[PDB]
Symmetry: D4
């Protein structure tokens, strides 16, 4: 789990987190993201940041929080 | 130049370009970028996008134009 | 042409046009849209409105104007 | 009911739900919607989405929750 | 006329004009307003301001210009 | 008390309540507002609505909720 | 003239200029501001920046541009 | 401490606090601020306000709480 279960449970690669609450330009991982390094690097390659969001869907601003450690 | 002159004449690396207008999460280039390949190459080294923005200052959101050549 | 050439030249089906300038939740037609009726009905079926936008890309808010007649 | 009770207890048809929070371009239901199939059926007849919102008023954006059953 | 012609050529009563640009909480005039005294007189009968806006539709925020004569 | 004690405790006359949370164009009562009618009418005369806000200060958007009954 | 005549002609001391277009928390000079230094220092004392705005009125966000030199 | 602990536990100097929530145009303190008089004294030396914010990072707007003691 790179994201907690529950609310912010859906890991997405997003350009930025506005106000640390709004994940903007989010698109879902293309590989399997089972650790924080995997998640992070997979996003920093896409020119995205690793976020955990309230829905698994991609493009459309939505609530997110950053992945821990990162 | 990798930016026009006149209004949008400052290269900055930004996370995204909201509405294609507003540059968010930008940084001043740290190297000298004089081609479009080098610009987005220096920005990708940040997960950033090459933009052309109304000012040299990177703190506080800005009016930005997507870089040409990228 | 359901959209003018030039700036607002890219026909998209979008949930709404904020301030008559910002097309929100936009996704591109799935069929061929060669008249205003075709364009319109194709969008009203997707629960979208027909807009003409400054880019052919889908999800990400962007500048748009409504299609004429509609 | 097709909405909870408490806070988000008003069915309204809206174009979209910005951030999953803000209902935009909403209308008061014109028919009586007492199942979730009927609700989004009455909304789709507008290109709208069934939402559950903090008030009965449809003019001015609102805090809204996606309908359950839709 | 109590509005110009061209762009801002629709009188509407609105609660305020955000940034002097965005008309918020507007209503269609219910009476015929053909002087500037009568316009803000018909709007004040709502706690509203007389504005001149880009469209006749009052649902959804709008680009508006403060009325002249008021 | 036209406003609850605590958070939304400061009665202001405001042009509108954005998203039912943000009181915009707020200016403080010029008379004494000791009942809901007094509060309300005093605002509807100023072309404002009666709101209860998180601070007694006037011009600057701030969190508010509508006065009860009104 | 610390501000041009015409559009951005009204000198105000404002907390910040959002997107270099929106003067936020603006209040008018308390002394006479006849040069750029006078204007600037008078604002930097109020914890404001010197801006030139489209109206002489204080509190309410409005279009502004920074004073030259500063 | 000049900030609480828990959520809003980072002192930053910011131009304003939009809605009393969003800290805009902030900077990291450059000196050590351990009283409330010293904090707004170090911020006023910038035309800034002492705020207590959810993170140590000052680039990109933030959730902030007005400083207590100021
Ligand atoms: C209006 C549509 C924008 C896309 C068209 C191409 C750029 C136009 C630049 C406008 C002038 C400002 O540009 S600048 O060259 O002065 O920096
Ligand atoms: C906080 C996460 C939101 C998704 C969880 C499910 C809805 C929670 C409703 C919160 C209370 C308000 O709802 S209501 O039942 O009172 O109308
Ligand atoms: C740009 C500054 C605005 C204030 C100046 C006076 C109004 C200018 C109207 C611009 C054209 C649109 O107006 S309209 O007459 O076509 O409706
Ligand atoms: C909700 C109203 C806000 C004003 C009341 C006083 C501050 C409340 C802090 C909420 C918890 C977060 O604060 S913190 O101590 O954890 O940083």
């Amino acid at each position: 789990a790179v994201c907690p279960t529950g609310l912010f449970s859906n890991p997405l690669c997003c350009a930025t987190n506005v106000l640390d609450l709004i994940g903007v330009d989010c698109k879902t991982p293309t590989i399997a993201v089972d650790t924080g390094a995997i998640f992070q690097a997979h996003c920093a390659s896409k020119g995205s940041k690793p976020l955990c969001c309230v829905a698994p869907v991609a493009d459309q601003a939505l609530l997110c929080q950053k992945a821990i450690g990162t």
